[PDB]
Design a protein around this ligand. Structure first.
Ligand SMILES: Nc1ncnc2c1ncn2[C@@H]1O[C@H](CSCC[C@H](N)C(=O)O)[C@@H](O)[C@H]1O
Ligand SMILES: [K+]
Length: 265
């Protein structure tokens, strides 16, 4: 991750940045047996540094490494910055299953169009989408995310702490089918304005039917489902588009999001 410059270096080529010895860099990936792609801590610029000038300092899983990149590169308490850091690392360093910047354009439009006062995310992972949505909630508005994996939950918590969004989000530890019935009970929710679906692709139908059967859906509650089409959510995308209880709308960027506005029982 963290490297230091051993020698001063003026930029030659078209793709490299300049630096003084002692400047730190956080490394995105190598290229040849030389060249790294990196971010200057001094200027936040991304570019190529030659391996002859640079060496590792001492800064396990992909998930701590995304979190570590954010804490080195992004401005804390600035959600836009954190999103750009995760985007940057997951573009050039390591693929990760966050909804990207692309599908995140869609969510921004849906979140903005429908001003939810209360959102349920199913699948936090590294906290990318939680930040993406919570940065757009009106003051007072709440986000609730559900994450099985306690490991993914621990990272999501730090990622929110870093973004400054911890105060308007609440991670819930467990599987969906465990937690969804607990919702009105244990976390005083009446109905849900919006639900985001990016957890395991098969559970998109139990949980939908469960939430319905739990009353948490109201007329007008918006269901947004990631990874229809790619991976593939085939019985969800059939249940919902043929049920009179949902008006569906499809969006691309070819993967896509399905908007499913609940029209009632
Ligand atoms: N049934 C379930 N209940 C709660 N969390 C689940 C779940 N099935 C899968 N998950 C979690 O959902 C995550 C899916 S990856 C989702 C990425 C995230 N929505 C983003 O865009 O940034 C994984 O971390 C997995 O642990
Ligand atoms: K995916």
């Amino acid at each position: 991750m963290l490297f230091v410059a051993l020698y001063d270096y003026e930029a030659r080529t078209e793709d490299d940045l300049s630096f003084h010895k002692g400047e730190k860099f956080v490394i995105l990936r190598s290229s040849e047996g030389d060249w790294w792609l990196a971010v200057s801590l001094t200027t936040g610029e991304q570019g190529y540094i030659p391996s002859n000038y640079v060496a590792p300092v001492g800064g396990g899983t992909k998930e701590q490494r995304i979190l570590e990149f954010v804490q080195l590169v992004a401005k804390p308490g600035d959600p836009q910055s954190v999103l750009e850091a995760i985007d940057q690392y997951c573009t050039y360093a390591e693929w990760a299953m966050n909804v990207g910047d692309a599908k995140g354009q869609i969510m921004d439009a849906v979140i903005r169009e429908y001003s939810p006062s209360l959102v349920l995310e199913l699948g936090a992972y590294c906290g990318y989408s939680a930040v993406r949505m919570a940065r757009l909630l009106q003051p007072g508005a709440r986000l609730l995310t559900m994450e099985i994996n306690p490991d993914c939950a621990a990272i999501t918590q730090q990622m929110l702490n870093f973004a400054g969004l911890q105060d308007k989000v609440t991670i819930l530890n467990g599987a969906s089918q465990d937690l969804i019935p607990q919702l009105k009970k244990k976390y005083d929710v009446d109905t849900l304005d919006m639900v985001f679906l990016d957890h395991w692709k098969d559970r998109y139908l139990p949980d939908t039917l469960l939430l319905e059967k739990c009353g948490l859906l109201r007329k007008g509650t918006v269901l947004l489902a990631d990874n229809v089409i790619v991976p593939g959510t085939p019985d969800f995308l059939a249940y919902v588009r043929g049920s009179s209880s949902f008006e569906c709308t499809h969006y691309s960027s070819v993967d896509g999001l399905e908007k499913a506005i609940y029209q009632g029982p």
